[PDB]
Amino acid sequence: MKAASVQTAATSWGTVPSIRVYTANNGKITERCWDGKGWYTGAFNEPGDNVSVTSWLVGSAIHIRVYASTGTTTTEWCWDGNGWTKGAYTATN
Amino acid sequence: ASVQTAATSWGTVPSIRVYTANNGKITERCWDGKGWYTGAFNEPGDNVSVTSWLVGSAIHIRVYASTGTTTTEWCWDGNGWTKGAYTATN
Amino acid sequence: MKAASVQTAATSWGTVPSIRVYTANNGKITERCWDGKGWYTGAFNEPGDNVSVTSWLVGSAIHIRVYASTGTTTTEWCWDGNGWTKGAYTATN
Ligand SMILES: O=S(=O)(O)c1cc2c(O)c(c1)Cc1cc(S(=O)(=O)O)cc(c1O)Cc1cc(S(=O)(=O)O)cc(c1O)Cc1cc(S(=O)(=O)O)cc(c1O)C2
Ligand SMILES: O=S(=O)(O)c1cc2c(O)c(c1)Cc1cc(S(=O)(=O)O)cc(c1O)Cc1cc(S(=O)(=O)O)cc(c1O)Cc1cc(S(=O)(=O)O)cc(c1O)C2
Ligand SMILES: OC[C@@]1(O)OC[C@@H](O)[C@@H](O)[C@@H]1O
Ligand SMILES: OC[C@@]1(O)OC[C@@H](O)[C@@H](O)[C@@H]1O
Ligand SMILES: OC[C@@]1(O)OC[C@@H](O)[C@@H](O)[C@@H]1O
Ligand SMILES: OC[C@@]1(O)OC[C@@H](O)[C@@H](O)[C@@H]1O
Ligand SMILES: OC[C@@]1(O)OC[C@@H](O)[C@@H](O)[C@@H]1O
Ligand SMILES: OC[C@@]1(O)OC[C@@H](O)[C@@H](O)[C@@H]1O
């Protein structure tokens, strides 16, 4: 397809800080990461036309949730330290 | 091309709120650590963003619902959703 | 064509609180601000069809990152206490 304009979502944590920026582009969401020393590409790569994100700390451990939507189906993807796993989020859109 | 979403979270449980704009209406799904359920937020909007903050242990949520060039702010402050003072000149 | 629905992004900090709302409208992003005493127009004004935002505190100092996208080009804008400056962010494409 052709990407008219991409759509991003962003989250951050700590004081360095760490930042994650998710970009929905041509039905694919990819991730860019900053941990204080340059931007690099993250492991998140899942389908989606629209993305939102939230994150929180448990102690010094980061937890990230990415809500990826295509059509009326939103899939939650979870980062809890050991790879991206599909979460329990469901909606009836 | 799809529904549009916005998400916020608070605490360490955590609580999460996910807002979805679909065909002109924004609805809300909630996580408080024990399963997803539908929340009380239901207002018009084609586009949505959200932010939230804690005062002590109390949560305050602001949802920015946009239709055309008009953005309406909706406020949760512990007892129902009320319209906020936000305006813009778009 | 009639102007399509605007797209917004929001961040907040502290307990007053301070809130910043960014609106992408007809290719331009503007900013509205709240710090407890009425909404007002902020200094941020840059091109973009899409906007996302994140912010974090270092002590009392707020740091804001706005991701403004036009086409497939995302520009990061940085607030670190004294004016907006362009950040190092580049995307995968
Ligand atoms: O159905 S698709 O999404 O695959 C599609 C592919 C192409 C298309 O040309 C179009 C759709 C139609 C079309 C849409 C738009 S938009 O909806 O406003 O984005 C714009 C154009 C257009 O032909 C005009 C146009 C603009 C530009 S740009 O100003 O540089 O972004 C480039 C092109 C355009 O045709 C060339 C072009 C690039 C691309 S690329 O995949 O982005 O390289 C695909 C297609 C192209 O015609 C080939
Ligand atoms: O096609 S739409 O469903 O978006 C539509 C909604 C409304 C409409 O009145 C029209 C279309 C017709 C219309 C078309 C055009 S044109 O296509 O650009 O020539 C222009 C107008 C118009 O009413 C005039 C107009 C423009 C604008 S602005 O471009 O955003 O400044 C706003 C309005 C206009 O009447 C007010 C308005 C707002 C809204 S909103 O969605 O609540 O913001 C809906 C409708 C409105 O008429 C109600
Ligand atoms: O250190 C990089 C990384 O592991 O950080 C956590 C998540 O953002 C992952 O997708 C990403 O690859
Ligand atoms: O650990 C994963 C999980 O339980 O985290 C909290 C929520 O995001 C849930 O939807 C998700 O499945
Ligand atoms: O526990 C559910 C609830 O009361 O939480 C706070 C707000 O998100 C409300 O819309 C929602 O119904
Ligand atoms: O208590 C509601 C309110 O004052 O909260 C702070 C801002 O969100 C204002 O727009 C809003 O009217
Ligand atoms: O007090 C307003 C202001 O300085 O707050 C920080 C940034 O949001 C600036 O763009 C904005 O003008
Ligand atoms: O001080 C600016 C900067 O270094 O802050 C951290 C990241 O946002 C970088 O992209 C950015 O250039």
Author numbering:
A (entry chain A), C (entry chain C): -2 to 90
B (entry chain B): 1 to 90
Text taken from the publication that reported this structure:
Using the trimeric β-propeller Ralstonia solanacearum lectin (RSL) as a scaffold, we generated a series of mutants with extended and dynamic N-termini. Specifically, we show that the rigid, bowl-shaped sulfonato-calixarene (sclx4) captures cationic N-terminal motifs, resulting in ordered structures.
In the MKA-RSL – sclx4 and MKAA-RSL – sclx4 structures, Lys1 is encapsulated by the calixarene in the known binding mode, involving at least one salt-bridge and one cation−π bond. Elongating the N-terminus results in greater steric accessibility of the lysine, which is now favored over Met0 for sclx4 binding. In the MKAA-RSL – sclx4 structure, the two calixarenes bind at similar sites but in different orientations. This suggests “fluxionality” of the sclx4 – protein exo-interaction, i.e. the calixarene can slot into the groove in one-way or another. At 1 eq sclx4, the original weak signal is unperturbed and a new high intensity signal appears downfield. No further changes occurred at 2 eq sclx4. This system was in slow exchange, suggesting micromolar affinity, and likely corresponds to lysine capture, as observed in the crystal structure.
